[PDB]
Design a binder for this molecule. Structure first.
Ligand code: HEM
Ligand code: HEM
Lengths: 110, 110
């Protein structure tokens, strides 16, 4: 069986990557989720316009990811997450989100 | 303190992702490399007319990643690696490589 990777690509206001990444330090139940293995939250280097932050989540299977989306901890962790376009989202530096999905065909950890 | 991530984004001829990823299976010295932490080789799930395979390498720092690039171990591991666009790259289904670089602002491994 192959592991699965999801990417949430977050287009952000210039300069907001650090404050946005700081929000992930506070664990909100991901550590209790079946099939979850690891996550990286990255800032793209050398960006000239908007900041770019990606949430990369690594799963035992695509099904594990699918179920996470329907979970109470997912809902709770995102209850104060807004896009700038949301009616109550003006103060948010998060401009858009885009999801990408991957099959992990090879992994190696030293 | 922050880890570093490099992404090699490879555009491939349709259908060649699987045979490309299989080329990674047997190690060629990466386990010996200072500051190397882990890697993922992914196929993108999408409806594009080309395949996409990514090499994600995770490093203790950007400097460790650059040292690897300069190394004999890198050179040896890539001796038969060609782009379709190379003089002698006729058999390669790898159409192009593009490098992206990231700060890892947060990581959690279960
Ligand atoms: C595929 C759907 C998504 C997945 C798999 C995902 C994954 C995650 C994970 C694993 C965490 C850590 C949660 C925890 O500590 O329990 C998190 C938190 C967070 N996510 Fe997502 N996410 C998704 C959708 C989104 C979207 C659309 C946004 C932006 C609009 C977003 C922005 C954030 C932010 C800012 C945090 C930090 C915690 C907070 O602000 O309260 N996520 N997400
Ligand atoms: C930023 C530059 C690059 C880095 C950091 C990198 C990293 C790696 C690593 C860690 C491995 C596994 C090596 C081992 O097992 O010891 C590998 C192998 C491999 N890489 Fe790269 N690589 C880079 C450039 C490229 C490019 C430009 C291509 C394609 C044109 C490529 C294609 C491959 C392939 C097909 C393998 C499997 C081994 C083989 O075919 O002999 N790499 N690379």
């Amino acid at each position: 069986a192959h592991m699965f990777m999801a990417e949430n690509r977050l287009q952000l206001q210039k300069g907001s990557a650090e404050e946005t990444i700081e929000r992930f330090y506070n664990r909100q139940g991901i550590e209790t989720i079946e099939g979850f293995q690891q996550m990286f939250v990255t800032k793209t280097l050398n960006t000239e316009d908007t900041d770019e932050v990606k949430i990369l989540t690594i799963w035992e299977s695509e099904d594990s990811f699918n179920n996470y989306l329907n979970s109470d901890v997912f809902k709770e962790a995102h209850k104060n997450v807004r896009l700038k376009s949301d009616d109550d989202g003006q103060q948010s530096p998060i401009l858009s989100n885009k999801v990408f999905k991957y099959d992990i065909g090879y992994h190696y950890q030293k």
